[PDB]
Design an enzyme around this catalytic site. Structure first.
Site, PDB file in Angstrom:
ATOM      1  N   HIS A  67       0.836  -1.193   0.000  1.00  0.00           N
ATOM      2  CA  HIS A  67       0.000   0.000   0.000  1.00  0.00           C
ATOM      3  C   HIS A  67       0.877   1.251   0.000  1.00  0.00           C
ATOM      4  O   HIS A  67       1.975   1.257   0.559  1.00  0.00           O
ATOM      5  CB  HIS A  67      -0.888  -0.065   1.252  1.00  0.00           C
ATOM      6  CG  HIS A  67      -1.956   0.978   1.362  1.00  0.00           C
ATOM      7  ND1 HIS A  67      -1.686   2.304   1.624  1.00  0.00           N
ATOM      8  CD2 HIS A  67      -3.308   0.860   1.390  1.00  0.00           C
ATOM      9  CE1 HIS A  67      -2.821   2.970   1.748  1.00  0.00           C
ATOM     10  NE2 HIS A  67      -3.822   2.114   1.618  1.00  0.00           N
TER      11      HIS A  67
ATOM     12  N   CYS B  50      -4.817   2.177  -3.797  1.00  0.00           N
ATOM     13  CA  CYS B  50      -3.639   2.698  -3.150  1.00  0.00           C
ATOM     14  C   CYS B  50      -2.441   1.771  -3.330  1.00  0.00           C
ATOM     15  O   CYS B  50      -1.564   1.663  -2.472  1.00  0.00           O
ATOM     16  CB  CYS B  50      -3.864   2.936  -1.643  1.00  0.00           C
ATOM     17  SG  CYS B  50      -5.319   3.864  -1.285  1.00  0.00           S
TER      18      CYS B  50
ATOM     19  N   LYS C  90     -10.825  -0.414  10.160  1.00  0.00           N
ATOM     20  CA  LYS C  90     -10.931  -1.694   9.476  1.00  0.00           C
ATOM     21  C   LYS C  90     -11.187  -2.854  10.429  1.00  0.00           C
ATOM     22  O   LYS C  90     -11.528  -3.950   9.963  1.00  0.00           O
ATOM     23  CB  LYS C  90      -9.662  -1.966   8.666  1.00  0.00           C
ATOM     24  CG  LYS C  90      -9.473  -0.969   7.527  1.00  0.00           C
ATOM     25  CD  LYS C  90      -8.132  -1.116   6.832  1.00  0.00           C
ATOM     26  CE  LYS C  90      -8.052  -0.120   5.687  1.00  0.00           C
ATOM     27  NZ  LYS C  90      -6.901  -0.407   4.782  1.00  0.00           N
TER      28      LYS C  90
ATOM     29  N   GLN D  30      -4.506  -5.202   7.184  1.00  0.00           N
ATOM     30  CA  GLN D  30      -5.452  -6.180   6.654  1.00  0.00           C
ATOM     31  C   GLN D  30      -5.323  -7.552   7.312  1.00  0.00           C
ATOM     32  O   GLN D  30      -5.865  -8.529   6.784  1.00  0.00           O
ATOM     33  CB  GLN D  30      -5.297  -6.340   5.132  1.00  0.00           C
ATOM     34  CG  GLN D  30      -5.596  -5.087   4.312  1.00  0.00           C
ATOM     35  CD  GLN D  30      -7.069  -4.690   4.323  1.00  0.00           C
ATOM     36  OE1 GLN D  30      -7.942  -5.491   4.668  1.00  0.00           O
ATOM     37  NE2 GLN D  30      -7.351  -3.443   3.933  1.00  0.00           N
TER      38      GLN D  30
ATOM     39  N   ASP E 146       3.166  -3.951   8.240  1.00  0.00           N
ATOM     40  CA  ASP E 146       1.879  -3.307   7.977  1.00  0.00           C
ATOM     41  C   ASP E 146       0.801  -4.369   8.150  1.00  0.00           C
ATOM     42  O   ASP E 146       0.577  -5.199   7.263  1.00  0.00           O
ATOM     43  CB  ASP E 146       1.877  -2.698   6.574  1.00  0.00           C
ATOM     44  CG  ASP E 146       0.541  -2.037   6.200  1.00  0.00           C
ATOM     45  OD1 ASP E 146      -0.434  -2.140   6.975  1.00  0.00           O
ATOM     46  OD2 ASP E 146       0.476  -1.414   5.106  1.00  0.00           O
TER      47      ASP E 146
HETATM   48  C1  LIG Z   1      -5.966   0.628   5.099  1.00  0.00           C
HETATM   49  C2  LIG Z   1      -4.562   0.340   4.661  1.00  0.00           C
HETATM   50  C3  LIG Z   1      -3.573   1.240   5.036  1.00  0.00           C
HETATM   51  C4  LIG Z   1      -3.918   2.654   5.418  1.00  0.00           C
HETATM   52  O1  LIG Z   1      -4.576   2.721   6.669  1.00  0.00           O
HETATM   53  P1  LIG Z   1      -5.328   4.082   7.088  1.00  0.00           P
HETATM   54  O2  LIG Z   1      -6.296   3.718   8.169  1.00  0.00           O
HETATM   55  O3  LIG Z   1      -6.034   4.689   5.893  1.00  0.00           O
HETATM   56  O4  LIG Z   1      -4.293   5.066   7.564  1.00  0.00           O
HETATM   57  C5  LIG Z   1      -2.242   0.860   5.037  1.00  0.00           C
HETATM   58  N1  LIG Z   1      -1.879  -0.411   4.675  1.00  0.00           N
HETATM   59  C6  LIG Z   1      -2.833  -1.323   4.310  1.00  0.00           C
HETATM   60  C7  LIG Z   1      -2.425  -2.713   3.934  1.00  0.00           C
HETATM   61  C8  LIG Z   1      -4.180  -0.952   4.300  1.00  0.00           C
HETATM   62  O5  LIG Z   1      -5.097  -1.889   3.921  1.00  0.00           O
END
Ligand SMILES: *Cc1c(COP(=O)(O)O)cnc(C)c1O
Ligand SMILES: *Cc1c(COP(=O)(O)O)cnc(C)c1O
EC number: 2.8.1.7
Lengths: 405, 405
Positions: B122, B363, B225, B202, B199
């Protein structure tokens, strides 16, 4: 005319009991209680319209994006900005000032320049400028205070020169309630090519604010002090300035383009400065708070609050050995100390009576040092506070003085 | 065992109609709907316990501070961090990564070093590293993809060396649903003295996550999320690392001391990285979301979601000219394109049927470029989605293909 009883009925927290006694919440300057119109607006968004907001294709996302941009427009009208695109959604006043200090500050303040702040500033309007000046090799200058809590305006000729890039100045002191003469200071700053950031976090709930009349270059405030949710604030920036500011924090929503070989491009401002998923829930709540305040009428609010303040200052004359800090014409807050008793002990007894005041340095240690005290008590008198609550404060201070004296 | 009908009854948005038709919300990967347990927990805090939280003297402020630190503890147990003080409250995943890249990155990545990311990241886990590398004079290296949406692990010997300071890597791709082999990649990174940021935005809603087992140095995810409110996320940092990190954004709540003559000192981490008034409302909501998810059981959620995903992939075989991207064992999301039709048109028809999917680059433009497409459609299959909603998606794609073919 204003009806405090009708207003209070909108705020469910005011029915609370603290220590088995009815709450007297005199700490709105730290954060304001919220009406059910604001609480329910956010809850209803979550219950019936929730989605991500990056102009998504599907209906909920498209409608959520429109709601968020409608709040931006509503906020721009609330402060009489010329365009909705001059407002940036920020986490709060602190983040808004950090955004200006990094994005605008880093490319406009150079070695040998100076920035001017005042001795009454909240830490949020001091530390970013200290850090910028260190990064860049510039000098931080300080407007000193008078004993009555007003600025020593006579010192301005010694602080402003052709190297002054920025005046960062509070609209209303969060401790003293002093309202500064922004329009005239802004005129002087602009004569030297200096920009002006106004910390308006203690102004926007007390009377109308008009950034075109003020002619300020930046203006910041926080939603949670404006009867709104936490996690949301507003940064106003003149369009001509904002459209030249480089990016700050990076990622999605603020990029136009990401390439691993060709690098990254950025989207246009205001959205350039809103990286990641925005606080859509808080933005919905903030819009409802602006509607609620506008429905009451800021001039009606100001009139009622000024009357309450005049009554409190009159009644507090009957407290022995009370020291007040700040000018006679203060807005919103009364800073005080009781005899030689530490503020912490005074606030603890007041809390024991169900009365919530704030104690400590109030995020203004240089202001405490000017008055040669480590701490103060502070009572806020907001639009839902009453004469009876003022009477409880006055009686409580009298009892504390009699008990600990 | 898991009961989707009972779960769905907790989510008021799922009764919504879109375009006169019952909503099929297949976009939880962009942001999740929230149960009334979460919505009401935040609303009740505002209605009955609201105050500022900087260990204020009075009862509401003291109790609000305790609530916030209890959520920090609850979040640390949710990811099996060793200490609550290893978690920082951030605006979301994007801000958490920017915090690491500035605070830790600026003092640990030097000219001639390198940082490794992957081609499936992302933008939030790309742009901060691009900017850091530029600031510092370091090289950004990229793990490339295989056609099935997995990483080309065989390239790791060419990317890791003694100058590699950081691996920044997604736990689960927000497009492909690929789950990366973090434990083994982390072992390799640590053999070279490199740290690892994961990260996890998800991952945390699909199965249990254990940062001590993973041994990652940083871990980030977003509340919205995870069925929680907007404006709040979590950054986990190993205590030994976090306690050495210098400040980032400046002001109150994060300073220990402000002097105009002697300068400023900072408070201890985790609070060092939480400047200004925190998003107390969002923190309350996030705690309720963690309790809600833990009550359902992440292993029960994973089992139900895996069954739904297996059913969807089986049923989608009956859609002509459908292209799927990613591995057979994907979590959470199905990325696809229909024939030669643009994703925007496919998602518009699906929305016209009441079905919410996301279209565009998600993104992840470098990922789109790898597959030589400008955009994709993406359907999320979360714990409140049903077989019937999968059937509506399959039928809709069949109708779209027949109508536009
Ligand atoms: C949602 C997403 C982000 C960004 O998170 P935000 O809540 O918009 O700051 C970063 N990495 C991954 C894999 C995402 O799915
Ligand atoms: C509240 C306050 C701030 C800080 O605002 P946050 O919402 O905590 O970021 C800054 N300046 C003044 C005058 C304040 O009263």
């Amino acid at each position: 005319i204003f009806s405090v009883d009708k207003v209070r009925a909108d705020f469910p927290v005011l029915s609370r009991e603290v220590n088995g006694l009815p709450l007297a919440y005199l700490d709105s300057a730290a954060s304001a209680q919220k009406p059910s119109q604001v609480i329910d607006a956010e809850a209803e968004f979550y219950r019936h319209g929730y989605a991500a907001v990056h102009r998504g294709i599907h209906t909920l996302s498209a409608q959520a994006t429109e709601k968020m941009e409608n709040v931006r427009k509503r906020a721009s009208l609330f402060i009489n900005a010329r365009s909705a695109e001059e407002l940036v959604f920020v986490r709060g006043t602190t983040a808004g000032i950090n955004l200006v200090a990094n994005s605008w500050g880093n490319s406009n303040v150079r070695a040998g320049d100076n920035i001017i702040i005042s001795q009454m500033e909240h830490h949020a309007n001091i530390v970013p400028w200290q850090m910028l000046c260190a990064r860049v090799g510039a000098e931080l200058r300080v407007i000193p205070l008078n004993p009555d809590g007003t600025l020593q305006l006579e010192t301005l000729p010694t602080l402003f020169d052709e190297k002054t890039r920025l005046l960062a100045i509070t609209h209303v002191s969060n401790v003293l309630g002093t309202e500064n003469p922004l329009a005239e200071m802004i005129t002087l700053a602009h004569q030297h090519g200096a920009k002006v950031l106004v910390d308006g976090a203690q102004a926007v709930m007390h009377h109308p604010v008009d950034v075109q009349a003020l002619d300020c270059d930046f203006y910041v405030f926080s939603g949670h002090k404006l009867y709104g949710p936490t996690g949301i604030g507003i940064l106003y920036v003149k369009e001509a300035l904002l459209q030249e500011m480089p990016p700050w924090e990076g990622g999605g929503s603020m990029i136009a383009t990401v390439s691993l070989s060709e690098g990254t491009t950025w989207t246009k401002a205001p959205w350039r400065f809103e990286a990641g998923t925005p606080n859509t829930g808080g933005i919905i709540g903030l819009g409802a708070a602006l509607e609620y305040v506008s429905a009451l009428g800021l001039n009606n609010i100001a009139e009622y609050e000024q009357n309450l303040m005049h009554y409190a200052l009159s009644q507090l004359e009957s407290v022995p050995d009370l020291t007040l800090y700040g000018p006679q014409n203060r807005l919103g807050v009364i800073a005080f100390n009781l005899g030689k008793h530490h503020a912490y002990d005074v606030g603890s007894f007041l809390d024991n009576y169900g009365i919530a005041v704030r104690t400590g340095h109030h995020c203004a240690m240089p202001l405490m040092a000017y008055y040669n005290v480590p701490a103060m008590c502070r009572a806020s008198l907001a639009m839902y506070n009453t004469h009876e609550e003022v009477d409880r404060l006055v009686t409580g201070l009298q009892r504390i003085h009699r008990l600990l004296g």
